[model samples]
Target chain A: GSHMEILWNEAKAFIAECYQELGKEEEVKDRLDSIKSEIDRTGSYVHTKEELEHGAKMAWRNSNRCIGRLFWNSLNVIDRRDVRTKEDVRDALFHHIETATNNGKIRPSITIFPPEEKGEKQVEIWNHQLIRYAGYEGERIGDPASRSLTAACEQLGWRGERTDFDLLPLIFRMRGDEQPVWYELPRSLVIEVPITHPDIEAFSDLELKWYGVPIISDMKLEVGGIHYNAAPFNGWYMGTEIGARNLADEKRYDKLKKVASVIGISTNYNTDLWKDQALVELNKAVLYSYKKQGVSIVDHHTAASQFKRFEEQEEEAGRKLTGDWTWLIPPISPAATHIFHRSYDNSIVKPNYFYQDKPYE
Target chain B: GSHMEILWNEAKAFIAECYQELGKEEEVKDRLDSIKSEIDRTGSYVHTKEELEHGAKMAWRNSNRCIGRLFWNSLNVIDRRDVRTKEDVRDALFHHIETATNNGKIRPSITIFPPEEKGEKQVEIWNHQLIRYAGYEGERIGDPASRSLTAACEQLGWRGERTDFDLLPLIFRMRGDEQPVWYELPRSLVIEVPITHPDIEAFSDLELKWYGVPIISDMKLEVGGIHYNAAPFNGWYMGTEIGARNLADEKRYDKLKKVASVIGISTNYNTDLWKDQALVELNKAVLYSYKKQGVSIVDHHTAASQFKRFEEQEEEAGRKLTGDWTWLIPPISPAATHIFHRSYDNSIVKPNYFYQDKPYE
Candidate 1:
């Protein structure tokens, strides 16, 4: 009884606040009553489109872990509350990728699915991100941030060619009794930018590529106390996320040395500063290639400035922003960015996104 | 009276714990009496060499931020606990570099200076490290670690040839001194390893080099309740400390691109994995060169294994080990290391190494 009442009251408050903020004061009581009756019957309630959209935006705003929250309100949310079957989930996700890719003017978007019901397994995306490469046999033929999904996909009868850059199959499953299903992403649906240094012609021959969108699909979206377990969302790329870490990190592609050697820089020692120079050009190539492909991406410098503005805007809004300094700062030129000098409180608040269990788990 | 007692009691507990751990229980009571009398008369007490050495080792053992603490007991503690003047400080530090270098068989060592005293400005080392190159003008003609020292050194009539790798002068001062004194590190006294790739003959021409030892001279050592603000310590290199971060990071020498261009690896894209290749080769060169020179350096894998042993040894001693996981894990092949699979509690304990006020500040 206590558990039911706690979520019920929280849901009521959330709905009331939503209506008040949306300037629909007259409907607040009616919305609250509907949520109360639903909670009594199903022990949880659904949200209207107005409430869902606002809640998604609020989740982004309250995403203490994100540095890109400055554009929270600009999110293009795709409401797929009716999606259930594996096929339907796949179709909706494909649509999310296609629409958000938007010919490189990438849209910040989310695809929300039905929430968990009592006595059953919840619908979920097992992948760390909608788009991630597969890693195999102690060698990164592909990725890290999602090896569990990679293994899960393989267990479900998906096989890789063992190439150094195989994109993992997208896998999903329904809770309780069903085996997980998988789908190979069609090449055309996933837009990739071929990275090439602007000044180095030989660098173009290495044939490096990266997917345009970064859709994270494993987080639960809680709104008005209702949990949407399969809400996949994305923002455009930040160059350093790929250039400085993914491709350069030893566990991943480990490409910095290869790039440095190809570019004819010194690899003799750290003092020659060879790796540092290579990271810059690698980042330059990413930004340049994305721009050449007409895809939207933010450079670290611009992102830092935007973040500064975000801080000021939050202050003017009479709200103190909470952030995780480690995540908010760009991997490259961190000290050059304003975020480096500041400390942030990483307190977690609700009505937000959260990690859910892997589909296979 | 109450304020003094609180700190005095804290000191007592710390000393008691130290003595108990060292199995010198017979001396505990006598030591406590001496500390009480000393504090009553002078507000601070002196540490005998045994006490100072134990405190220094324990400080490293409790250095929650350090990954190199596995060899805390192996440190060679030079008791400069007697030096008082600036000239003596310079002579002792020069001796530290020569002895610690050991002609490339680098030893983990520290030359502990006098502790802080009430109503007196403490002697302090002003450089970030005893050995770091200066970064000049927007170009790295030297070290990027201490820009303030670079600026301050120039004002004191020291000049750089404006080359890309000029080592900065060692600077130090009393806390309330009129001006800081500088000493140019003689080339013969400072040993640097010239970096060169085994396969890439052109790499040798880049003329990159790094000093043989990493002697950190800025941390405060707290033992019992006393603060020794001038304790500097050294450790042998962990290859990735140079290969993965110092040289690879863009803010430093940033040589990866140049090396890639020279090695002729395809830098065209992230998939080309040029950076990863370059990083591996750079690390290979570092390990190779140091080994060829008979210099003592540990690779990440070996260090991780040693750290594993350290953890086991610590457990046997019945001490709960503390560490910052993010730092303990090497930047390269992190997942390959055992530390990556483990989580650590970052709870800071006392009798530890700590960041003190900057000497210039």
Candidate 2:
């Protein structure tokens, strides 16, 4: 909010949020000392966070767990000098946050329609938050999910980058029930946080309501200028519909006075809590994906024909590390800042080949 | 916390927090529709909540303008597909967000120091948030100033596999002050909108406070959840002596009879909601960076000669876009996103270039 303006007042965002909360407790004690030093150097060790939650639930059931293949396998080993163990680095970071939630492929994006009575584009407008999908009639919106989905992401070339994709509001329904509409995280790369999980003893006892977001005590006294609470927003509000709808017409009461709003709010006030609407929508979707950003091409069309038979897989996940994942390549004195050669120039840290998204200025 | 423990109960964390709050509103409307389709192709089409607060203040000034060589010399013109004009793509995107923000390299990251003593590590642990400085002692920690610093992503090498820049919160704070912190943002990244900001417009007509976190009387229970926030968190719970001996110690109050309380509740609401001084001394600086998975560089020698003279003034700002702003390079394929690629193939994009808390497995 201080884009850098008024130069981050409030005592340097309070010393960059106290050095990002002590660099997130040294990134959770370097992720529990890389899972007890990769189970004491590779004897297989996800070591109780309940077996790193049973090897991130068996690597999200052998990759059906595709959060853009868990952020394309968490930037596929960002070179901590070729990791040696901690269940080979927590089975590659529990396949990058369980592939950012079982590969909705960066939040449910696939929309296709055209069929009223024939001519096939059918996958009828889907919308997992915002990973949209309208009717495709097979005239190509990834051709009937390349013959009706074995799980898609354009059958797996895993395209992703619909501009970085991000979202994380685990659950919601404040009586407005589910679909009146508007559900994004389907992309634009997100991962905000006020709530999250995976054992800090299930958040010590912060009690896991999907990841917890409740703070607002007049939001730390309106950012410390103090004083506030004339009382209003506790849960939900928005109303309007008033009187004898101009007796049926008057342009439908001027379209209900240009769309309603007399007022509304309630969460039962910190108790029954909207009958645990999905544990407060998974603690407001892991405190809104730990802040936010987006992208997830759910297995790009079931691995886009296994990423087009990944140059004939002898298996190493069908090879493609693009010479040391160097920040997707583009520097060789090319105006030099050899950014220490960005792990070699970043192609999502090198894998197979084909991975497009270039339209700048 | 169960990425996949037999799909970890409580009805799959409440249908994964109601599909992560309906997929984070499609990741904030495809990143505010790519900066509102390039600021409404520029002739200032404002409206629609003032183009969502000027596309959230031009996407928080190009996401805090992380100087990618002044966004590559405001897109070093290759004649953006020979612009027929929208004022030549609004004078080439306001010459790419103002010469990538007057060469701080984009957004605006500043710094000044030198008010004296520049030497133990030559007084350079200064980021004050991208005001950039670090020369002698290297990196007692980060924010070396822009080009999107995460220490330019580990000296431009990048790593920590899938999700492990040793499990990010990225720490390093010796400095001091009162501590307890947080900083929410979102009234469209704020150029002012706590309800119209002519200096906090009478407390933004009363219900606006996302940054220091407050606004929750229910705009569908949470409302655009990302402004930012953190509080009373850096240190000094009672200002030491073991934070005044964990509340005047009785063996840190009978070490809470040794520990165990997921939800039966009452650890005195976890030591009166300070989460026991953020898991005690912030889990000893996240277990000393989880037993040092990384973070400790501090050897700047004038931040290696002002980042090699800001990478030789970024190749003289990439030849000032070759003659009269050569229509700043936008012939597609620059949808940006080339990160780390010098043939970066680590078996499918994993860049943890080495820090280690474990992984020999």
Highest lDDT against the true fold, candidate: 1
Each prediction's whole-model lDDT (CA): 0.79, 0.22
Candidate 1 interface RMSD (Å): 8.6
Candidate 2 residue-wise lDDT at A175: 20
DockQ for all models, in order? 0.09, 0.01
User: Model 2 over residues A108-160: C-alpha lDDT tens digits?
Assistant: 11111111111111111121222222212213222122122212323333232
Q: Please give each candidate's TM-score.
A: 0.72, 0.17
How much native contact recovery, as a fraction, does model 2 achieve? Answer: 0.00
Going through the candidates in order, state the TM-score of chain A alone for each one.
0.95, 0.17
Q: Candidate 2 chain A: minimum summed lDDT over ten consecutive residues — where? A: A231-240
lDDT of 2 by residue, B208-292 (tens): 2111111111010000211111000000011111112221233222222222132122444211222232222222222222123
Residue B118 lDDT (model 2): 14
